[PDB]
Amino acid sequence: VHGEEYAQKMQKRFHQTDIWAPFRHRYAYMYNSSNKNVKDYKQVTLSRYINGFDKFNV
Amino acid sequence: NTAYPTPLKTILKTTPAFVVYFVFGLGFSTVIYDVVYHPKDRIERFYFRSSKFERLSRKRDEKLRHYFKPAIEWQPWYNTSTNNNTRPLLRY
């Protein structure tokens, strides 16, 4: 809506286009840079006691 | 006469205490196991006990279910106006 040249100027990040450096707010460190809990805090505190929270990857 | 040897009879006095201790300890361990074994249909290994490749395979489906579908099906009016949304995978 603000001009075709404006959009490509705003969506442009790197002069060189042969390097992939995706945007990240932060970088993970724990668990060899991974996530152990991929659930909400309520699911975090309830899945340890209550059944029906884990979908049983088989 | 077929009585017990004297050294054995003295130490036999403490045996019922050992028995009740074993009963209580077995109950404690069994309750811990059962509480752990109910939500997960098996005794789940600790996440940090697996290799780097294993850690990705065990959490891929949960990532897809919790963060991929709501993002690929996102609409501007889907979000709640109360600002209490689901938290990011990495907290910044």
CSV table of N, CA and C in Angstrom, one decimal:
chain,number,residue,atom,x,y,z
A,1,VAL,N,0.8,-1.2,0.0
A,1,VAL,CA,0.0,0.0,0.0
A,1,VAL,C,0.9,1.3,0.0
A,2,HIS,N,2.1,1.2,0.3
A,2,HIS,CA,3.0,2.3,0.4
A,2,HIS,C,4.0,2.3,-0.7
A,3,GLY,N,3.8,1.6,-1.8
A,3,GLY,CA,4.6,1.6,-3.0
A,3,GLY,C,5.4,0.3,-3.1
A,4,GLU,N,5.5,-0.1,-4.4
A,4,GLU,CA,6.2,-1.4,-4.7
A,4,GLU,C,7.7,-1.4,-4.3
A,5,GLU,N,8.3,-0.2,-4.5
A,5,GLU,CA,9.7,-0.1,-4.2
A,5,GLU,C,9.9,-0.1,-2.7
A,6,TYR,N,9.0,0.4,-1.9
A,6,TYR,CA,9.1,0.4,-0.5
A,6,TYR,C,9.1,-1.0,0.1
A,7,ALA,N,8.2,-1.9,-0.4
A,7,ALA,CA,8.1,-3.2,0.2
A,7,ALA,C,9.4,-4.0,0.0
A,8,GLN,N,10.0,-4.0,-1.2
A,8,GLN,CA,11.3,-4.7,-1.4
A,8,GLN,C,12.4,-4.1,-0.6
A,9,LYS,N,12.4,-2.8,-0.4
A,9,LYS,CA,13.4,-2.2,0.5
A,9,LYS,C,13.3,-2.6,1.9
A,10,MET,N,12.0,-2.8,2.4
A,10,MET,CA,11.8,-3.2,3.7
A,10,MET,C,12.0,-4.6,4.0
A,11,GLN,N,11.8,-5.5,2.9
A,11,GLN,CA,12.0,-6.9,3.1
A,11,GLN,C,13.5,-7.3,2.8
A,12,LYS,N,14.4,-6.4,2.5
A,12,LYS,CA,15.7,-6.7,2.1
A,12,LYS,C,16.6,-6.6,3.4
A,13,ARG,N,17.4,-7.6,3.6
A,13,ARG,CA,18.3,-7.6,4.8
A,13,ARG,C,19.8,-7.6,4.5
A,14,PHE,N,20.2,-8.5,3.6
A,14,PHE,CA,21.6,-8.7,3.4
A,14,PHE,C,22.0,-8.3,1.9
A,15,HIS,N,23.2,-7.7,1.8
A,15,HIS,CA,23.7,-7.4,0.5
A,15,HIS,C,24.1,-8.7,-0.2
A,16,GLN,N,24.8,-9.6,0.5
A,16,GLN,CA,25.2,-10.9,-0.1
A,16,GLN,C,24.1,-11.9,0.2
A,17,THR,N,23.7,-12.7,-0.8
A,17,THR,CA,22.5,-13.5,-0.7
A,17,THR,C,22.9,-15.0,-0.7
A,18,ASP,N,24.2,-15.4,-0.4
A,18,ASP,CA,24.6,-16.7,-0.4
A,18,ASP,C,24.8,-17.3,1.0
A,19,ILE,N,24.4,-16.5,2.1
A,19,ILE,CA,24.6,-16.9,3.5
A,19,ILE,C,23.2,-16.8,4.1
A,20,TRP,N,22.8,-17.9,4.8
A,20,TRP,CA,21.6,-18.0,5.5
A,20,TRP,C,21.8,-17.7,7.0
A,21,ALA,N,21.3,-16.5,7.4
A,21,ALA,CA,21.3,-16.1,8.8
A,21,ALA,C,19.9,-15.7,9.3
A,22,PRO,N,19.1,-16.7,9.6
A,22,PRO,CA,17.7,-16.4,9.9
A,22,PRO,C,17.6,-15.6,11.2
A,23,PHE,N,16.5,-14.8,11.3
A,23,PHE,CA,16.4,-13.9,12.5
A,23,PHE,C,16.0,-14.8,13.7
A,24,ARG,N,16.6,-14.4,14.8
A,24,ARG,CA,16.3,-15.1,16.1
A,24,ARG,C,16.3,-14.0,17.2
A,25,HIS,N,15.3,-14.0,18.0
A,25,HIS,CA,15.3,-13.1,19.2
A,25,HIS,C,16.4,-13.5,20.2
A,26,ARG,N,16.6,-14.8,20.4
A,26,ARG,CA,17.6,-15.4,21.3
A,26,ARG,C,18.1,-16.7,20.7
A,27,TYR,N,19.1,-17.2,21.3
A,27,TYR,CA,19.7,-18.5,20.9
A,27,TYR,C,19.6,-19.5,22.1
A,28,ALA,N,19.1,-20.7,21.8
A,28,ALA,CA,19.0,-21.7,22.8
A,28,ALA,C,20.3,-22.3,23.3
A,29,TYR,N,20.4,-22.6,24.5
A,29,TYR,CA,21.7,-23.2,25.1
A,29,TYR,C,21.5,-24.5,25.8
A,30,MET,N,20.4,-24.6,26.6
A,30,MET,CA,20.2,-25.8,27.4
A,30,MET,C,19.8,-27.0,26.6
A,31,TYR,N,20.1,-28.2,27.1
A,31,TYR,CA,19.8,-29.4,26.5
A,31,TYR,C,20.4,-29.5,25.1
A,32,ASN,N,21.7,-29.1,24.9
A,32,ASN,CA,22.4,-29.1,23.7
A,32,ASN,C,21.7,-28.2,22.7
A,33,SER,N,21.2,-27.1,23.1
A,33,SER,CA,20.5,-26.1,22.3
A,33,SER,C,19.2,-26.7,21.8
A,34,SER,N,18.3,-27.1,22.7
A,34,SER,CA,17.1,-27.7,22.4
A,34,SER,C,16.0,-27.4,23.4
A,35,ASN,N,14.8,-27.8,23.2
A,35,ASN,CA,13.7,-27.6,24.1
A,35,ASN,C,13.2,-28.9,24.7
A,36,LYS,N,13.1,-29.0,26.0
A,36,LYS,CA,12.6,-30.2,26.7
A,36,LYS,C,11.1,-30.2,26.8
A,37,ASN,N,10.5,-29.1,27.2
A,37,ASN,CA,9.1,-28.9,27.4
A,37,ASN,C,8.6,-28.0,26.2
A,38,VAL,N,7.7,-28.6,25.4
A,38,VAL,CA,7.1,-27.9,24.2
A,38,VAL,C,5.6,-27.8,24.5
A,39,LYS,N,5.3,-27.6,25.8
A,39,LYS,CA,3.9,-27.4,26.2
A,39,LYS,C,3.8,-26.3,27.1
A,40,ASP,N,2.5,-25.8,27.3
A,40,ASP,CA,2.3,-24.7,28.3
A,40,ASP,C,2.6,-25.1,29.7
A,41,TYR,N,2.7,-24.1,30.5
A,41,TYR,CA,3.1,-24.3,31.9
A,41,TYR,C,2.1,-25.2,32.7
A,42,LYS,N,0.8,-25.0,32.3
A,42,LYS,CA,-0.3,-25.9,32.9
A,42,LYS,C,-0.1,-27.3,32.5
A,43,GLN,N,0.2,-27.5,31.2
A,43,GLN,CA,0.5,-28.9,30.7
A,43,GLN,C,1.8,-29.4,31.3
A,44,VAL,N,2.8,-28.5,31.6
A,44,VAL,CA,4.0,-28.9,32.2
A,44,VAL,C,3.8,-29.4,33.6
A,45,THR,N,2.9,-28.8,34.4
A,45,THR,CA,2.7,-29.2,35.7
A,45,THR,C,1.6,-30.2,35.9
A,46,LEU,N,0.8,-30.5,34.8
A,46,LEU,CA,-0.2,-31.5,34.9
A,46,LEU,C,0.1,-32.8,34.2
A,47,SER,N,0.9,-32.8,33.2
A,47,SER,CA,1.2,-34.0,32.5
A,47,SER,C,2.0,-35.0,33.3
A,48,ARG,N,2.6,-34.5,34.4
A,48,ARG,CA,3.4,-35.4,35.2
A,48,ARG,C,2.5,-36.3,36.2
A,49,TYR,N,1.2,-35.9,36.3
A,49,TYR,CA,0.3,-36.6,37.2
A,49,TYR,C,-0.9,-37.1,36.5
A,50,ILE,N,-1.4,-36.3,35.5
A,50,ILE,CA,-2.7,-36.6,34.9
A,50,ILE,C,-2.5,-37.2,33.5
A,51,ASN,N,-3.3,-38.3,33.3
A,51,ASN,CA,-3.3,-39.0,32.0
A,51,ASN,C,-4.0,-38.1,30.9
A,52,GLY,N,-3.7,-38.5,29.7
A,52,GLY,CA,-4.4,-37.8,28.6
A,52,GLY,C,-3.6,-36.6,28.0
A,53,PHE,N,-2.4,-36.3,28.5
A,53,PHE,CA,-1.7,-35.2,28.1
A,53,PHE,C,-0.6,-35.5,27.0
A,54,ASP,N,-0.2,-36.8,26.9
A,54,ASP,CA,0.9,-37.2,26.0
A,54,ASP,C,0.2,-38.0,24.9
A,55,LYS,N,0.6,-37.7,23.7
A,55,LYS,CA,0.0,-38.4,22.5
A,55,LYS,C,0.7,-39.6,22.0
A,56,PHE,N,1.7,-40.1,22.8
A,56,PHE,CA,2.3,-41.4,22.6
A,56,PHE,C,2.9,-41.6,21.2
A,57,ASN,N,3.9,-40.9,20.9
A,57,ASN,CA,4.7,-41.0,19.7
A,57,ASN,C,5.1,-42.5,19.5
A,58,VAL,N,4.5,-43.2,18.6
A,58,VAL,CA,4.9,-44.6,18.3
A,58,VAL,C,5.4,-44.8,16.9
B,1,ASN,N,16.0,-82.1,71.5
B,1,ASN,CA,15.9,-80.6,71.4
B,1,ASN,C,16.5,-80.1,70.1
B,2,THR,N,15.8,-79.2,69.4
B,2,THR,CA,16.3,-78.7,68.1
B,2,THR,C,16.1,-77.1,68.1
B,3,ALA,N,16.7,-76.5,69.2
B,3,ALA,CA,16.6,-75.1,69.3
B,3,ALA,C,17.5,-74.4,68.4
B,4,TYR,N,17.3,-73.1,68.2
B,4,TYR,CA,18.2,-72.3,67.4
B,4,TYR,C,19.6,-72.1,68.0
B,5,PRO,N,20.6,-71.8,67.2
B,5,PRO,CA,21.9,-71.4,67.8
B,5,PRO,C,21.7,-70.1,68.5
B,6,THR,N,22.5,-69.9,69.6
B,6,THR,CA,22.3,-68.7,70.4
B,6,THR,C,22.7,-67.4,69.7
B,7,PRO,N,23.8,-67.3,68.9
B,7,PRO,CA,24.0,-66.1,68.1
B,7,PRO,C,22.9,-65.7,67.2
B,8,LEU,N,22.2,-66.7,66.6
B,8,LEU,CA,21.1,-66.3,65.6
B,8,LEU,C,19.9,-65.8,66.4
B,9,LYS,N,19.6,-66.3,67.6
B,9,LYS,CA,18.4,-65.9,68.3
B,9,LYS,C,18.5,-64.5,68.7
B,10,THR,N,19.7,-64.0,69.1
B,10,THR,CA,19.8,-62.6,69.5
B,10,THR,C,19.4,-61.6,68.4
B,11,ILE,N,20.1,-61.8,67.2
B,11,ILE,CA,19.9,-60.9,66.1
B,11,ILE,C,18.5,-61.1,65.5
B,12,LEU,N,17.8,-62.1,65.8
B,12,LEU,CA,16.4,-62.3,65.3
B,12,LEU,C,15.4,-61.4,65.8
B,13,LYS,N,15.7,-60.7,66.9
B,13,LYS,CA,14.8,-59.7,67.5
B,13,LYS,C,14.5,-58.5,66.7
B,14,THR,N,15.5,-58.1,65.9
B,14,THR,CA,15.4,-56.9,65.0
B,14,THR,C,14.7,-57.2,63.7
B,15,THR,N,14.4,-58.5,63.4
B,15,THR,CA,13.9,-58.8,62.1
B,15,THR,C,12.5,-58.2,61.8
B,16,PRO,N,11.5,-58.2,62.7
B,16,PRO,CA,10.2,-57.6,62.4
B,16,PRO,C,10.3,-56.1,62.1
B,17,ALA,N,11.3,-55.4,62.7
B,17,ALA,CA,11.5,-54.0,62.4
B,17,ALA,C,12.0,-53.9,60.9
B,18,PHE,N,12.9,-54.8,60.5
B,18,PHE,CA,13.3,-54.8,59.1
B,18,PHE,C,12.2,-55.1,58.2
B,19,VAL,N,11.2,-56.0,58.6
B,19,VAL,CA,10.1,-56.4,57.7
B,19,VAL,C,9.2,-55.2,57.5
B,20,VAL,N,8.9,-54.4,58.6
B,20,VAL,CA,8.0,-53.3,58.5
B,20,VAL,C,8.7,-52.2,57.7
B,21,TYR,N,10.0,-52.0,57.9
B,21,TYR,CA,10.7,-51.1,57.1
B,21,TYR,C,10.7,-51.4,55.6
B,22,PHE,N,10.8,-52.7,55.3
B,22,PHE,CA,10.7,-53.1,53.9
B,22,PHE,C,9.3,-52.9,53.3
B,23,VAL,N,8.3,-53.1,54.1
B,23,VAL,CA,6.9,-52.9,53.7
B,23,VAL,C,6.7,-51.4,53.4
B,24,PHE,N,7.1,-50.5,54.2
B,24,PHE,CA,7.0,-49.1,54.0
B,24,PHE,C,7.8,-48.7,52.8
B,25,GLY,N,9.0,-49.1,52.7
B,25,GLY,CA,9.8,-48.7,51.5
B,25,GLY,C,9.3,-49.2,50.2
B,26,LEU,N,8.8,-50.5,50.2
B,26,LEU,CA,8.2,-51.0,49.0
B,26,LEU,C,6.9,-50.2,48.6
B,27,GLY,N,6.1,-49.8,49.6
B,27,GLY,CA,5.0,-49.0,49.3
B,27,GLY,C,5.4,-47.7,48.7
B,28,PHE,N,6.4,-47.0,49.3
B,28,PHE,CA,6.8,-45.7,48.8
B,28,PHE,C,7.3,-45.8,47.4
B,29,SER,N,8.2,-46.8,47.1
B,29,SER,CA,8.7,-47.0,45.7
B,29,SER,C,7.6,-47.3,44.7
B,30,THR,N,6.7,-48.2,45.2
B,30,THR,CA,5.6,-48.6,44.3
B,30,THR,C,4.7,-47.4,44.0
B,31,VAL,N,4.4,-46.5,45.0
B,31,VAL,CA,3.6,-45.3,44.7
B,31,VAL,C,4.3,-44.4,43.8
B,32,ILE,N,5.6,-44.2,44.0
B,32,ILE,CA,6.3,-43.3,43.0
B,32,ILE,C,6.2,-43.8,41.6
B,33,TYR,N,6.5,-45.1,41.5
B,33,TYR,CA,6.4,-45.8,40.1
B,33,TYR,C,5.1,-45.6,39.5
B,34,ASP,N,4.0,-45.9,40.3
B,34,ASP,CA,2.7,-45.9,39.7
B,34,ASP,C,2.2,-44.4,39.4
B,35,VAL,N,2.6,-43.5,40.2
B,35,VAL,CA,2.3,-42.1,39.8
B,35,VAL,C,3.0,-41.7,38.6
B,36,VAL,N,4.3,-42.1,38.4
B,36,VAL,CA,5.0,-41.8,37.2
B,36,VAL,C,4.4,-42.6,36.0
B,37,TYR,N,4.1,-43.9,36.2
B,37,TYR,CA,3.7,-44.7,35.1
B,37,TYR,C,2.2,-44.5,34.6
B,38,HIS,N,1.4,-43.7,35.3
B,38,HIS,CA,0.1,-43.5,34.9
B,38,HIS,C,0.0,-42.6,33.6
B,39,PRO,N,0.5,-41.3,33.7
B,39,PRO,CA,0.2,-40.4,32.6
B,39,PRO,C,0.9,-40.8,31.3
B,40,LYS,N,2.2,-41.3,31.4
B,40,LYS,CA,2.9,-41.9,30.3
B,40,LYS,C,2.7,-43.5,30.4
B,41,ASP,N,2.2,-44.1,29.4
B,41,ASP,CA,1.9,-45.5,29.4
B,41,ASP,C,3.1,-46.4,29.6
B,42,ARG,N,4.3,-45.8,29.7
B,42,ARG,CA,5.5,-46.4,30.0
B,42,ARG,C,6.3,-45.6,31.0
B,43,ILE,N,7.5,-46.1,31.4
B,43,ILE,CA,8.4,-45.3,32.2
B,43,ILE,C,9.2,-44.5,31.2
B,44,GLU,N,8.9,-43.2,31.0
B,44,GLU,CA,9.6,-42.4,30.0
B,44,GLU,C,11.0,-42.1,30.4
B,45,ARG,N,12.0,-42.3,29.5
B,45,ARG,CA,13.4,-42.0,29.8
B,45,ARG,C,13.5,-40.5,29.9
B,46,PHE,N,14.5,-40.1,30.7
B,46,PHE,CA,14.8,-38.6,30.8
B,46,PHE,C,15.2,-38.0,29.5
B,47,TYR,N,14.8,-36.8,29.2
B,47,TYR,CA,15.1,-36.2,27.9
B,47,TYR,C,16.6,-36.0,27.8
B,48,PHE,N,17.3,-35.6,28.8
B,48,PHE,CA,18.7,-35.4,28.8
B,48,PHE,C,19.5,-36.7,28.6
B,49,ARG,N,18.9,-37.9,28.7
B,49,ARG,CA,19.5,-39.1,28.6
B,49,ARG,C,19.7,-39.6,27.2
B,50,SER,N,19.2,-38.9,26.2
B,50,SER,CA,19.2,-39.3,24.8
B,50,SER,C,20.2,-38.4,24.1
B,51,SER,N,20.6,-38.9,22.9
B,51,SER,CA,21.5,-38.2,22.0
B,51,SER,C,20.8,-37.0,21.3
B,52,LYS,N,21.6,-36.2,20.6
B,52,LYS,CA,21.1,-35.0,20.0
B,52,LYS,C,20.1,-35.3,18.9
B,53,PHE,N,20.3,-36.3,18.1
B,53,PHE,CA,19.3,-36.7,17.1
B,53,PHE,C,18.1,-37.3,17.8
B,54,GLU,N,18.2,-38.1,18.8
B,54,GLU,CA,17.0,-38.6,19.5
B,54,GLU,C,16.2,-37.5,20.1
B,55,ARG,N,16.8,-36.4,20.7
B,55,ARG,CA,16.1,-35.3,21.3
B,55,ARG,C,15.2,-34.6,20.3
B,56,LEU,N,15.6,-34.6,19.0
B,56,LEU,CA,14.8,-33.9,18.0
B,56,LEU,C,13.7,-34.8,17.6
B,57,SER,N,13.8,-36.1,17.5
B,57,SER,CA,12.8,-37.0,17.1
B,57,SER,C,11.7,-37.1,18.1
B,58,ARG,N,12.0,-37.0,19.4
B,58,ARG,CA,11.1,-37.2,20.5
B,58,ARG,C,10.2,-36.0,20.7
B,59,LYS,N,10.6,-34.8,20.3
B,59,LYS,CA,9.9,-33.5,20.4
B,59,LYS,C,9.4,-32.9,19.1
B,60,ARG,N,9.6,-33.6,18.0
B,60,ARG,CA,9.2,-33.0,16.7
B,60,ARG,C,7.6,-33.0,16.7
B,61,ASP,N,7.0,-34.1,17.0
B,61,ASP,CA,5.5,-34.1,16.9
B,61,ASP,C,4.8,-33.1,17.8
B,62,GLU,N,5.3,-33.0,19.0
B,62,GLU,CA,4.8,-32.0,19.9
B,62,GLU,C,5.0,-30.6,19.4
B,63,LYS,N,6.1,-30.3,18.9
B,63,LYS,CA,6.3,-29.0,18.3
B,63,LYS,C,5.3,-28.7,17.1
B,64,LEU,N,5.1,-29.7,16.3
B,64,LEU,CA,4.2,-29.6,15.2
B,64,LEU,C,2.8,-29.4,15.7
B,65,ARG,N,2.4,-30.1,16.7
B,65,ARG,CA,1.0,-30.0,17.2
B,65,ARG,C,0.8,-28.6,17.9
B,66,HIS,N,1.8,-28.1,18.7
B,66,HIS,CA,1.6,-27.0,19.5
B,66,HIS,C,1.9,-25.7,18.9
B,67,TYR,N,2.9,-25.6,18.0
B,67,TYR,CA,3.4,-24.4,17.4
B,67,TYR,C,3.3,-24.3,15.9
B,68,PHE,N,3.0,-25.4,15.2
B,68,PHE,CA,3.0,-25.3,13.7
B,68,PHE,C,1.5,-25.1,13.2
B,69,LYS,N,0.6,-25.9,13.7
B,69,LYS,CA,-0.8,-25.8,13.3
B,69,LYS,C,-1.4,-24.4,13.7
B,70,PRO,N,-1.3,-23.9,14.9
B,70,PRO,CA,-1.9,-22.6,15.2
B,70,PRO,C,-1.2,-21.5,14.4
B,71,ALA,N,0.0,-21.7,13.9
B,71,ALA,CA,0.7,-20.7,13.1
B,71,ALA,C,0.4,-20.7,11.6
B,72,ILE,N,0.2,-22.0,11.1
B,72,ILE,CA,-0.1,-22.1,9.7
B,72,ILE,C,-1.6,-21.9,9.5
B,73,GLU,N,-2.4,-22.0,10.5
B,73,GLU,CA,-3.9,-21.7,10.4
B,73,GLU,C,-4.2,-20.3,11.1
B,74,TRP,N,-3.2,-19.5,11.3
B,74,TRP,CA,-3.4,-18.2,12.0
B,74,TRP,C,-4.3,-17.3,11.1
B,75,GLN,N,-5.2,-16.5,11.8
B,75,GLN,CA,-6.0,-15.5,11.3
B,75,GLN,C,-5.9,-14.3,12.2
B,76,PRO,N,-6.1,-13.1,11.6
B,76,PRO,CA,-5.9,-11.9,12.5
B,76,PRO,C,-6.9,-11.8,13.6
B,77,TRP,N,-8.1,-12.3,13.5
B,77,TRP,CA,-9.1,-12.3,14.5
B,77,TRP,C,-9.2,-13.6,15.4
B,78,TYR,N,-8.2,-14.5,15.2
B,78,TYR,CA,-8.1,-15.7,16.0
B,78,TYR,C,-7.7,-15.4,17.4
B,79,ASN,N,-6.7,-14.4,17.5
B,79,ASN,CA,-6.1,-14.2,18.8
B,79,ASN,C,-7.1,-13.6,19.8
B,80,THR,N,-6.8,-13.9,21.1
B,80,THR,CA,-7.6,-13.3,22.2
B,80,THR,C,-7.2,-11.8,22.4
B,81,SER,N,-8.1,-11.0,22.7
B,81,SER,CA,-7.8,-9.6,23.0
B,81,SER,C,-7.4,-9.4,24.5
B,82,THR,N,-7.4,-10.4,25.3
B,82,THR,CA,-7.0,-10.4,26.7
B,82,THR,C,-5.5,-10.4,26.8
B,83,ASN,N,-4.7,-10.6,25.7
B,83,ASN,CA,-3.3,-10.6,25.7
B,83,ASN,C,-2.6,-11.8,26.5
B,84,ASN,N,-3.4,-12.8,26.9
B,84,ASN,CA,-2.9,-13.9,27.6
B,84,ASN,C,-2.8,-15.1,26.6
B,85,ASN,N,-1.8,-15.0,25.7
B,85,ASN,CA,-1.6,-16.0,24.6
B,85,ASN,C,-0.7,-17.1,25.1
B,86,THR,N,-0.4,-18.0,24.2
B,86,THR,CA,0.6,-19.1,24.5
B,86,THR,C,2.0,-18.5,24.4
B,87,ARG,N,2.8,-19.0,25.2
B,87,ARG,CA,4.2,-18.4,25.3
B,87,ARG,C,5.1,-18.9,24.2
B,88,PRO,N,6.1,-18.2,23.8
B,88,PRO,CA,7.0,-18.7,22.8
B,88,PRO,C,7.8,-19.9,23.3
B,89,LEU,N,8.3,-20.6,22.3
B,89,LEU,CA,9.1,-21.8,22.6
B,89,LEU,C,10.4,-21.4,23.3
B,90,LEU,N,11.0,-20.3,22.8
B,90,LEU,CA,12.2,-19.7,23.5
B,90,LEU,C,11.7,-18.3,24.1
B,91,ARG,N,12.0,-18.1,25.3
B,91,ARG,CA,11.5,-16.9,26.0
B,91,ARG,C,12.5,-15.8,25.9
B,92,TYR,N,12.1,-14.6,25.4
B,92,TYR,CA,13.0,-13.5,25.2
B,92,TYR,C,12.4,-12.3,25.9
